[PDB]
Design a protein around this ligand. Sequence first.
Ligand code: SIA
Ligand code: CA
Ligand code: CA
Ligand code: CA
Ligand code: CA
Ligand code: CA
Ligand code: CL
Ligand code: CL
Ligand code: CL
Ligand code: CL
Ligand code: CL
Ligand code: CL
Ligand code: CL
Ligand code: MG
Ligand code: MG
Lengths: 281, 27, 57, 57, 138, 264, 264
Amino acid sequence: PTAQSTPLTSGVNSQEVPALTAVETGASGQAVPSDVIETRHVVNYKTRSESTLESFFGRSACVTILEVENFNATTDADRKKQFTTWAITYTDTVQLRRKLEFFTYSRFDLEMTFVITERYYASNTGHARNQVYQLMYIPPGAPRPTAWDDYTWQSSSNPSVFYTYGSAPPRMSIPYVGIANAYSHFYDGFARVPLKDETVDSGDTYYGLVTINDFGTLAVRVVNEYNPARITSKIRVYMKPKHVRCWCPRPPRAVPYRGEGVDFKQDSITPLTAVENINTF
Amino acid sequence: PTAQSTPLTSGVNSQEVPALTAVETGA
Amino acid sequence: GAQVSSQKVGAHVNYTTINYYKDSASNAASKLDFSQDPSKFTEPVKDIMIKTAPALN
Amino acid sequence: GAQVSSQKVGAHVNYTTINYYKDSASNAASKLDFSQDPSKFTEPVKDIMIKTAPALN
Amino acid sequence: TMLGEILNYYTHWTGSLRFTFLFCGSMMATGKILLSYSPPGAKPPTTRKDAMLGTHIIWDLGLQSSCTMLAPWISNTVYRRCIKDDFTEGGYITCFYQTRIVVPSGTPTSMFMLAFVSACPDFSVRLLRDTNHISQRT
Amino acid sequence: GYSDRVRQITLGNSTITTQEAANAVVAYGEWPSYLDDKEANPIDAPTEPDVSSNRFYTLDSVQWKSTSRGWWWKLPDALKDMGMFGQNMYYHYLGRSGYTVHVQCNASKFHQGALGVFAIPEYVMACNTEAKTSYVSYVNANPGEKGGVFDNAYNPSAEASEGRKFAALDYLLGCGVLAGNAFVYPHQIINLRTNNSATLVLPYVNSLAIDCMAKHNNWGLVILPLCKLDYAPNSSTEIPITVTIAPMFTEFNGLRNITVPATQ
Amino acid sequence: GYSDRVRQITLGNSTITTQEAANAVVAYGEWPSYLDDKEANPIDAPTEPDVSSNRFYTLDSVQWKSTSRGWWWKLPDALKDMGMFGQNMYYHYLGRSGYTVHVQCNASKFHQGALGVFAIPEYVMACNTEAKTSYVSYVNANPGEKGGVFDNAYNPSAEASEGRKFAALDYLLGCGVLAGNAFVYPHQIINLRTNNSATLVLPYVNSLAIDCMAKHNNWGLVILPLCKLDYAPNSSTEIPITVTIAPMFTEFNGLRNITVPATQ
Ligand SMILES: CC(=O)N[C@H]1[C@H]([C@H](O)[C@H](O)CO)O[C@@](O)(C(=O)O)C[C@@H]1O
Ligand SMILES: [Ca+2]
Ligand SMILES: [Ca+2]
Ligand SMILES: [Ca+2]
Ligand SMILES: [Ca+2]
Ligand SMILES: [Ca+2]
Ligand SMILES: [Cl-]
Ligand SMILES: [Cl-]
Ligand SMILES: [Cl-]
Ligand SMILES: [Cl-]
Ligand SMILES: [Cl-]
Ligand SMILES: [Cl-]
Ligand SMILES: [Cl-]
Ligand SMILES: [Mg+2]
Ligand SMILES: [Mg+2]
């Protein structure tokens, strides 16, 4: 299937007036060039292949950067650097988010890919053996780790991936896991109805998708015990929606995001650069 | 094979009493 | 000796398996078995109980 | 269970796919779907509008 | 409960829940008891006149010892989450005397019933996960 | 005889006429309908109140002036205290509904101005404090039939507790997108020289078959002056805009005691 | 297995069980039904609320003691504030309904007593002043779910303004006929040695197809102790009587704003 070819047409002198319409109806303009000019025949062999939803979304996009370290931790703060937990979301970054938010609802499977990098913290503390990483998906309700070597990492039921530094970026597919019939990118509502004269707090409650979304937690550790040399690591998380369907198009985000909601920032709500004059080519 | 679908039913006024049982039976 | 079977459906349909090893213990997971008979645990009674009837008559 | 399909043409014609996994979520990208119906957004009107006719009569 | 323990290996659940009650007073004790399930979003019922506006059954105590109340699957989402969660809250189960328990003389005036829970055949679970009910020191 | 400008709509005991319409929109080309067995979710026999609730309810009118920046409502919120629809909504945990939205604004052949009338699924709006995100009170999100107004200035609150309302900034559609692109949503325009009404028929839209009406608004209704009202003999003149909405194919599940939401 | 003593009744989201019934009465041998086109009167499409309203509502319980003279309720009055039934009743000028009435009273094999349970069409009762006739206030005639009680004495008021209530004299059935003849009305008896419940299914009964529910009660429900409650270990013991009633085949016409009756 191709885009529209142009038919051979000449001129008209007619009570048929395709150049006029009334957009009050809610219909967009419909006229094409053959309606308002003399056209030659042009066969159009070009296709809209690269603007299908699958093509538009068919990329692994970075959605967050996590940090973990491996060293002999002697304080509570340093013990917490030996592993990390991250609430799974696409709102830490802006690029994939904005593309998804052309739509109100979506349904897709996910390809997740990870890029893991290290550096030496210092050079006077010897070296470090090659590190193995554990990335554990903790669905809502499953126990979250409080230390890098607690019982949760045995991961009898949670899916974990063990990645060996220097090997190919690890990768797995996730099905469409939504508890509704599609994912909602926007939710105009609340998680509960506050009722007349109840004592529950109404002053610090939130609004929208953040009150109802929960895709679980990614927990990451280095499996190795500490070397004399402290190693610091970054884990970049990539998402590619595949087998995609979307519904109910929206205007795209026009101004910077300032969090997980639709809120905007007072110093950043002037996207247009003014033109010198209405007659500026 | 799927989990059980729910049939269209209305009300009853009947000597059939599926709401009562006796779990002493081990059922 | 390729086996072609239905995949578990995703967001939006067959797959192929060949066994490479001479021991069945080497094989991947058993195919989905939807068998069940809850009544051996939920109703292991000698005499049939009709729901709509009295349990004790 | 090999699927043979047309490739997207290049500068100057088929390819083969076998699914290796039991979950469809594991599959590669959906095949090109050229479906479209712009009129549900560009012309969602109750009464048909013929271009050559007046929009309001 | 057995159902609860199984659910804590999963993230999502759907379907109807069956609550079966066994009266364990004397044979000479009579009574009528209201058992109610109120889907969420309104004032939790603390009186019989609110409870009886929801899904309910009036249980007459007698030769058939047990009564089953259903919490039919009534949910916005197709699955609920196996955690405490406002969005997938399930509602309220309550119980009131419909009349009262009556006994003759020479009979205990206080007694008990046992409540059981089980899943119906429309019930299923998804998304395997580790439970929070077992752990060990490291 | 028949004309794109002249229409009658009857639902229940209520009828609307217009003699200066401009066709009618059926959002996404889909008429509302009841929920099919093959897409159903809650299993209790639903209440389908039909004519008691599926009828035109007329909201309080608002005044269009040369300085107006626009108006918004949410649905089913705007109808929550409307006759038997409101009662059915609040007695049940779950509800779904389509709508016929009829926006009314007449003037004269000497007035000018144009209103964009948009039906927006999941019309999530920005909050009015930069100390928090997604920080809007239930009461401010759900004003009912009075709806709210847009502004052409954004002045977020000094303290978080004072900014728990929408920052309904007109040119960003109250949600960080440019208003000129709102036409991707089902819409009509009331351009005073052409027409005096807009009609939009809306199916139920959600990622679920049925949902909690008291928690969740499925549609926003936005009326924005695209071209300001002007009238040469009196530039400070006001003309009413009246919004009349009928629920359609309403269906409710999970009956219990009545929901009474917080009011402060 | 099946027994005249064991019954289940399900209407809407509500179910009743009894294990000591005595059959069930269908008043005048006729099950309730919707209004046929060939017998219809108001022409507007009716509201038929079905499961929202056609379900068991349990009234406040009353206490049977050795000194009780009896209880009365009127219908649809007793259900006027019951969930969606009450809302549908008051939002419409016209309504019709049948009922399942389930009266509940258990005791023990050592208690004795018998209650007559009667469903009386057009249960008109005497007033309590001899300065006037037919002189009863709306408020006293329509007590709602609390109903009223009978007395074994008649003491009409000194002044007409003080006697605007029913003279519910037990042995005259509150209306100048002998109570022993109340059995010509659809009835059951709860005789404690035999049964613990009465079930009566009532069709709509009136000289019209449909009528104003807020003006007119179609049925009276009377519970009279025919043989007094007695219990040897404690003659002052009390046992509850609980009344649970489901509207059936409800149909309403003439929708408008809600009726709010006077309360004093
Ligand atoms: C992260 C970072 O900046 N690390 C730097 C360290 C640390 O600052 C100190 O060793 C800590 O005591 O210092 C170096 O001179 C080193 O050890 O070779 C360079 C190295 O890049
Ligand atoms: Ca031409
Ligand atoms: Ca072409
Ligand atoms: Ca049984
Ligand atoms: Ca035209
Ligand atoms: Ca109906
Ligand atoms: Cl481990
Ligand atoms: Cl190690
Ligand atoms: Cl310029
Ligand atoms: Cl309101
Ligand atoms: Cl409040
Ligand atoms: Cl009352
Ligand atoms: Cl009054
Ligand atoms: Mg109002
Ligand atoms: Mg009451």
